[PDB]
Write a protein that binds this ligand. Structure first.
Ligand SMILES: C[C@@H](NC(=O)c1ccc(C#Cc2cccc(F)c2)cn1)C(C)(C)O
Ligand SMILES: C[C@@H](NC(=O)c1ccc(C#Cc2cccc(F)c2)cn1)C(C)(C)O
Ligand SMILES: *[C@@H]1O[C@H](CO)[C@@H](O)[C@H](O)[C@H]1NC(C)=O
Ligand SMILES: *[C@@H]1O[C@H](CO)[C@@H](O)[C@H](O)[C@H]1NC(C)=O
Ligand SMILES: N[C@@H](Cn1oc(=O)[nH]c1=O)C(=O)O
Ligand SMILES: N[C@@H](Cn1oc(=O)[nH]c1=O)C(=O)O
Lengths: 768, 768
């Protein structure tokens, strides 16, 4: 049978401390546990044994009655703990009023399942899983530490503070690890953090299992550089040993938890490989009187602790020949000059242990005051200590702990606490230490960023993709996870408005330089400047000068035989036509307005009509007198021709209303032109074409008949050239968007011809 | 204290049956359990009590020693089971050699944790979670049923067979639910099934909790219509009651598990709400002799079962006045005419129970044979039955079950088994029943689709995304389950590369039919067909005929002074010019090849050079005769003019060589054209322009020359016409492209202009 500690008393309290290590993977069934522990073992046992004596000596708490204890070894294993708990409850089948719960959460759950049947309150000091907070399943359980909900919140705050997005998660198999990592996963996935892969491993797994786990961790090495470890000390140590074996010292950042905390025994020997690791340690100041008591302990004068001699041998590698447990495995013998002071560290959760024991004692005390106030001792009503009443008192108890602060239990039996964020750093040459780099308390994370990463080149941010919101490139998520994307450039037509989605603008808009939202593209038009329009207006002005010169010559030589046969009225009509033809050039090249549009249509439709309508009748009169009514009748024929033309124009004007249109030929450029349908343009052109065809027929009929210096031949030349000119611009016109400019050129050419291949001869004669 | 069923024997085997219901959420701490169960309670208790006596009577198994039992009630609760297991082991602190493990997995885990410390083999009959398969943690645990891995695989097969992609998951709090749903989630997400949201709920949760769960289920109702339930009977029943309360009458399909199976107690009264539900039942044939024994049981003659009278009262609502357990709560009394035959169903897992009991018997038998071969009974070495040897024998034992098939245990203590898929259907009016609609064995899912959904209108496929595999439209995801997508059309340029991305192909490329890929665009060359090229070739051919006719005529009268106007060599240079001018049409209008693009440039640049060079020299001789050298110098001057032309054209040829070049005007259409640069076309054209303008300056002088048939006038006509015609094609050429065709027409006509006005005057004379 396993050995246990004893201490006599009126009320006997139980305790489960992991004096020995967890049983090896091959020896779990035998249920024998390995090496003795100092921080987790002998220190806690001695702490309990001394705090009990302190309580007994102190008259203000639990007066006139002694408090005894029964310490057993759980070996940090659920099965060993269950057997020891059976040994506790064997008396129920001096009673154990309560138990100071085991370190592990899963072990605590097993022990609690057994204890709650016998109404034995269990106060833990390091059980942190949220599962134990449920008082329906675990009624007789309290703890002097907060749950790991707060620890998961702390880890996620630390991860988000450094914008770590793509992390890898490891948690120890059990209840602490599983619950911790479930909480972390929830809160991280909620707030943008993405987990590369969540792994699990047993603390007592072999070397090969840790090797395989680390290989899987390296499978996402370049990107996922931070491993959030909701792991125990031994899991972290296993990962460190794996890093040693496979040569991975110093490219992973291990974000630990309370399992790792401040422990030197998890990073001794393997300091080089855990440098930079960030851990979360429950805040607990060193208990000074415990150190004063502990450091003076000697193996000769300490008999009440059955594991103290084994601890003495293990710590200082030696053999004590004067004791039954010689343990001749060790080579040397230890002289009576070795002390615990050399290389002494007090376990971080010592305070909590003392608090837990006090939490019980005060509880009993409160019950003592409430159940029989008068008697200063174990009254008749107290002989069978009721576990239910003790649970109630323990629930409502409050006092001042060894640390100094007050401690209380909430509705779920937890206790308020804060965390200290620590970083494992290298200070000197071959000297590594834990450095306090921040705190976390009720949601607020305070952290120095100078002590950790004393440079702008910190650990490579655990991000699965560079921030791709640089210009036209858009984020596409490949299903991998929200946090691993690739990148596709969005085209110039479209704009990005929300991530993952870029859409095209309608027809006359263009994206801004920032490439968010599209604005209105500036509208281009006929541009009074520019070489082409200025050349057009130059030609138009020269044309106008020629027209006015010709009209002057005509009007100052009226009764000259040169202009005798030619109907003066017909000539007037021709000159007016040519003038308005030239004018509509300026009427075209301008800022498109309604007054400009309607006038340009009338001008273009009328001027050819007005010129050629009189021209045809003139040629007809000549051809008829050759072939051998008229005068006024000639004028009325010309006038009815122009009348039907004007009727057609006004009809088209009414049918299709003239308005300023914003044409969009391509996706980039926008122009404004006045709404003139295909029919709206081709109708005047059609009519004028019929007119010119009739005119060429009649001119060809006349051809080269002798006249007043033979005008007919020149008129025929002009008619042929003007027909050619009209036909020339058709392909450039009817399948493009240079409407106005080419119309300007066309009309200017078609008038210069007439004003030239007519009159200009006559002017020469006038000069002669 | 709780009552326990007894049967005396030499070896006592324990059992834990859920005789009563689970304690209510309010009465958990008191640890009192509710109403008595028939299928899971009295039937299993009576089955064990009868199977043991059957074994005792049978001499071939366990001869000469009797097998007793101690049956206890676990009330389907971990705490009650743990206290009853403590009652089992109390004697070890006549020994309980083994227990027939409790029904639920979580309860089995607690009991196993306690039992393995005392080396008591535990054979379950319905514990199915995978967690119990781990023999490191649970060494003394065996089961006569397969693990939940196979069941999760069965559910995944069922969901994938009906293309249910977007399902919602519910699982009962515990281990069976938790482990089952983890397995389902893993393999489903692996294959492609999608979980809308995974919910968890306690079996004994209040009505409010089930209401909230169902509200959350309906929050994803239109898209997630299938709920995969890894739940117990009571969880499913709670969901059905919730559906009744807030009005669901066939809106969800509940895909159940072993917990639901074919149980009537989960759907009795609430049949309308579970119609269409598909469940998975472990295959086990009904044990007939159990029914024969059970149906004859009376409360008067059955004393060994302490719960039988309570069961009698609960089943047939009545009171037995003739027994101490009157239970006066019931109003009426039971007449001696009530039999269990009325409305009798045997629980689905009866076979497994009897197999487990037989398994323990056979284990003991094998040990008895191996340890004490000679002695027919408990030998001296067998008096303290070692649990280790028993576990070993139980592990290696195999035999024939009640069903008929052989029973064996694997390395993990499991047993082979197969599943039956059942569907809850309505046959008659107010008549609902479970129908076997399939089976599942070692990966093979064989299931009839006629009995379920006897029509083409089955349940709406649980998909959150209408399959938009309709050619052009692609899939884009958006922060959520990579399972629900929005469909966006890709544009005409691009093709779908992978269903999540569509990319644009090359400049000269187009997507194929059904958007499978981008192929090469056909080239739309200048084909010999079509009206325009045919007309061009017609004109070229008539030009050739005219040229050859003229050259014939010219030699017919070669020296005659009538044709001997000027150097007759010039009037051969011009003929050659016209000929090769026409010949260039063919090399300009054919398939663009290297040789043909070589020839076209030379032809186009060269022909006008020679024609107009000879013309200009002729005009120079005429102008000299008017001004009043000539002789043969004019040939050399024409030759040096051609020399400068050929220098220029060859220089341009060298600077930019004609090759095969692919123009891309738009993204859709492509052509093949020779890469004659803009400079390459404007430079020879520029020179020829200079030549023609000057040839007119000279013609301007020669208007009125009385000469040999007055050639000068005709040449002036030709020169004016050719200048005009060159001017006419400016808009169509520079502008709407159509380079080759327009050039063909231009060169074809400009010759006829000369050949038409220049020469045939002389030929006219010959013909007079
Ligand atoms: C550009 C376009 N030309 C015209 O649509 C057009 C319209 C009118 C005129 C004229 C005139 C004129 C000329 C002399 C006197 C007079 F009164 C009027 C020319 N071209 C097409 C047909 C494609 O060549
Ligand atoms: C289309 C284009 N025309 C030409 O680039 C071009 C080039 C060559 C000719 C010719 C000729 C010819 C004429 C007679 C005899 C002979 F041997 C050759 C015409 N146009 C422009 C100037 C825009 O009209
Ligand atoms: C993380 O937060 C933002 C990310 O854009 C950045 O400005 C900041 O420098 C990052 N690092 C720290 C230590 O905050
Ligand atoms: C979907 O289910 C039907 C039969 O239920 C059958 O077409 C096939 O199994 C599935 N089809 C697809 C597209 O997966
Ligand atoms: N909360 C932890 C406590 N703990 O675990 C370790 O490995 N060290 C340590 O302090 C647990 O529940 O296990
Ligand atoms: N398969 C369940 C057992 N079980 O759950 C029920 O609801 N009925 C039933 O037999 C388990 O493995 O725990």
């Amino acid at each position: 049978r396993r050995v246990v500690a004893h201490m006599p008393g009126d009320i006997i309290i139980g305790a489960l401390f992991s004096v020995h290590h967890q049983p090896t993977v091959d020896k779990v069934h035998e249920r024998k546990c390995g090496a003795v522990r100092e921080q987790y073992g002998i220190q806690r046992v001695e702490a309990m044994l001394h705090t009990l004596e302190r309580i007994n000596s102190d008259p203000t708490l639990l007066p006139n009655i002694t408090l005894g204890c029964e310490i057993r070894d759980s070996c940090w294993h659920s099965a060993v703990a269950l057997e020891q708990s059976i040994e506790f409850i064997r008396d129920s089948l001096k009673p154990i009023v309560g138990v100071i719960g085991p370190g592990s959460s899963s072990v605590a759950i097993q022990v609690q399942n057994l204890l709650q049947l016998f109404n034995i309150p269990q106060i833990a000091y390091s059980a942190t899983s949220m599962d134990l907070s449920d008082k329906t399943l675990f009624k007789y359980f309290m703890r002097v530490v907060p749950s790991d909900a707060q620890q998961a919140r702390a880890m996620v705050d630390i991860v988000k503070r450094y914008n770590w997005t793509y992390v890898s998660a490891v948690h120890t198999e059990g209840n602490y690890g599983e619950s911790g990592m479930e909480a972390f996963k929830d809160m991280s996935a909620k707030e943008g953090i993405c987990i590369a892969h969540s792994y699990k491993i047993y603390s007592n797994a072999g070397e090969q299992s840790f090797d395989k786990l680390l290989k899987k961790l390296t499978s996402h090495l370049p990107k996922a550089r931070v491993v959030a470890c909701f792991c125990e000390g031994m899991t972290v140590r296993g990962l460190l040993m794996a890093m040693r074996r496979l040569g991975l010292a110093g490219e992973f950042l291990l974000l630990g938890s309370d399992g790792w905390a401040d422990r030197y025994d998890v990073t001794d020997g393997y300091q080089r490989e855990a440098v930079g690791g960030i851990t979360i340690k429950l805040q607990s100041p060193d208990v000074k009187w415990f150190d004063d008591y502990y450091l003076k302990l000697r193996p000769e004068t300490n008999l009440r602790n059955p594991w103290f001699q084994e601890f003495w041998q293990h710590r200082f590698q030696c053999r004590l020949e004067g004791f039954p447990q010689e343990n001749s495995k060790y080579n040397k013998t230890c002289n009576s000059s070795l002390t615990l002071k050399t290389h002494h560290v007090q376990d971080s959760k010592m305070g909590f242990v003392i608090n837990a024991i006090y939490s019980m004692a005060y509880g009993l005390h409160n019950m003592q005051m409430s159940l029989c106030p008068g008697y200063a001792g174990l009254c008749d009503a107290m002989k069978p200590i009721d576990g239910r009443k003790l649970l109630e008192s323990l629930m409502k108890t409050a006092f001042t702990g060894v640390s100094g602060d007050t401690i209380l239990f909430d509705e779920n039996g937890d206790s308020p606490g804060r965390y200290e964020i620590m970083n494992f750093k290298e200070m000197g040459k071959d000297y590594f230490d834990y450095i306090n780099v921040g705190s976390w308390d009720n949601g607020e994370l305070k952290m120095d960023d100078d002590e950790v990463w004393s440079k702008k080149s910190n650990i490579i941010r655990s991000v699965c993709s560079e921030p791709c919101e640089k210009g036209q490139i858009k984020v596409i998520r490949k299903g991998e996870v929200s946090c691993c994307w690739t990148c596709t450039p969005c085209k110039e037509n479209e704009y990005v408005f929300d991530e993952y989605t870029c859409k095209a603008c309608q027809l006359g808009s263009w994206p801004t330089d920032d490439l968010t939202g599209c604005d209105l593209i500036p509208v281009q038009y006929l541009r009074w400047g520019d070489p082409e329009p200025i050349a057009a207006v130059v030609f138009a002005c020269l044309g106008l000068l020629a027209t006015l010169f010709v009209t002057v010559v005509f009007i100052i030589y009226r009764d000259t035989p040169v202009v005798k046969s030619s109907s003066r009225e017909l000539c007037y009509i021709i000159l007016a036509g040519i003038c308005l033809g030239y004018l509509c050039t300026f009427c075209l090249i301008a800022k498109p307005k309604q007054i400009y549009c309607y006038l340009q249509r009338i001008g273009i439709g009328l001027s050819p009509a007005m010129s050629y309508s009189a021209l045809v009748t003139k040629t007809n009169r000549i051809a008829r007198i050759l072939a051998g009514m008229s005068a006024c009748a000639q004028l009325v024929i010309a006038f009815i021709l122009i009348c039907i033309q004007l009727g057609i124009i006004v009809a088209l004007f009414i049918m299709e209303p003239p308005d300023i249109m914003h044409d969009y030929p391509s996706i980039r450029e926008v122009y404004l032109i006045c709404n003139t349908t295909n029919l709206g343009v081709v109708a005047p052109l059609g009519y004028n074409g019929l007119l010119i065809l009739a005119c060429t027929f009649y001119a060809f009929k006349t051809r080269n008949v002798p006249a007043n210096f033979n005008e007919a031949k020149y008129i025929a030349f002009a008619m042929y050239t003007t027909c050619i000119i009209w036909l020339a611009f058709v392909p450039i016109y009817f399948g493009s968007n240079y409407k106005a400019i080419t119309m300007c050129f066309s009309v200017s050419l078609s008038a210069t011809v007439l004003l030239g291949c007519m009159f200009v001869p006559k002017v020469y004669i006038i000069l002669a």
